[PDB]
Design a protein around this ligand. Structure first.
Ligand SMILES: Cc1nc(C(=O)N2CCCC2)c(C)s1
Ligand SMILES: Cc1nc(C(=O)N2CCCC2)c(C)s1
Ligand SMILES: [Cl-]
Ligand SMILES: [Mg+2]
Ligand SMILES: [Mg+2]
Ligand SMILES: [Mg+2]
Ligand SMILES: [Mg+2]
Lengths: 194, 194
């Protein structure tokens, strides 16, 4: 019933643009929305986010997260490792590449979501969520070598999966950070399960 | 180590603005970013809420109540947690219970409320509280629940069993063009992984 009539460019930056979207509401009344898009997309999705499950025998299973200064937020954020998909890169390949660059871990693909939306009332941005396991007992993951590209400055934080939500809440209390909504949602469901 | 140096307005709409952000990198080098922000944030601890609504009924499996709506930024239908912006002076909890009733008809009971969490922190400063609400589906109030959508809100309610959430989302995505929200997907994935 609903659909886009037209899109007017408001402002285009290098990396982001702002549009005025004209759409038909279900009643046949025309309405407008203000919408954000990235200028970088081709591709399945703008990006990937990796859920990295670090598995070491005789240890609690951990979820590997990253902490970074985020200029839009004006502060530090705790997130899944993540980046944009290169032109002609598959989402699986982007996940393994970003996971290594940001954490130094080398992982295996467990599963890969369809394109999911980041903030659909605001932007068209989408990602694929990629669950990856990291055999933490392999030699290649003994001393994880992170390969940060230009301007990336990433701290790695591994938290136990079985208490993820209490651990995150504790970092927020102590360290003045913003947890990512996807990280939080995952953590919540771990507790809400069963 | 890192901090904001300046925020230069590039373009302001009615609802969203684009900024040129200048920040200090941890090597002591000045860099720039492009940042999205809403124009509607006041003294709220976040822009918005999203509601995790757990529908509970005797002799039923627990459902997660979701909503499907057309999203002009995406140009299509999206399946999401019930959500909306927090009104000036309104608490995140009150906003959650109000949005849940408006969008689904249900009258919930607060269970938990997250700290403010970031929606897409490499892009925007937008934040929400994730509010877990239980719905007593045996209460007569929640028997024949009628949405009270505000002007231009057009919302369908989709209740799915918690114990099969990911597969049930996959089956909806198999049957039409629709995008699942990344927070919904993260939550469904954790329900599987636990
Ligand atoms: C980025 C956008 N957000 C909204 C929105 O959700 N609004 C609901 C209350 C005021 C505006 C647009 C109408 S455009
Ligand atoms: C909204 C923005 N996103 C990025 C980003 O993550 N980029 C990674 C490759 C292209 C730029 C900015 C540098 S500004
Ligand atoms: Cl797993
Ligand atoms: Mg990244
Ligand atoms: Mg990276
Ligand atoms: Mg809403
Ligand atoms: Mg609403």
């Amino acid at each position: 019933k609903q659909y886009i009539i037209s899109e007017e460019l408001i402002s285009e930056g290098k990396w982001v643009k702002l549009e005025k979207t004209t759409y038909m509401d279900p009643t046949g009344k025309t309405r407008t929305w203000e919408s954000v898009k990235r200028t970088t997309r081709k591709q399945t999705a703008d990006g990937v986010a990796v859920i990295p499950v670090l598995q070491r025998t005789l240890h609690y299973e951990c979820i590997v997260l990253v902490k970074q200064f985020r200029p839009p937020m004006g502060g530090y954020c705790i997130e899944f490792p993540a980046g944009l998909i290169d032109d002609g890169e598959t989402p699986e390949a982007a996940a393994l590449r970003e996971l290594e660059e940001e954490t130094g871990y080398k992982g295996d693909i467990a599963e890969c979501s369809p394109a999911v939306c980041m903030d659909p009332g605001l932007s068209n941005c989408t990602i694929h969520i990629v669950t990856v396991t990291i055999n933490g007992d392999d030699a290649e993951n003994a001393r994880p070598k992170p390969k940060p590209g230009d301007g990336e400055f990433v701290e790695v934080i591994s938290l136990p999966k079985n208490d993820l939500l209490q651990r995150l809440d504790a970092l927020v209390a102590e360290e003045h950070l913003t947890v990512d909504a996807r990280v939080y949602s995952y953590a919540l469901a771990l507790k809400h399960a069963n």
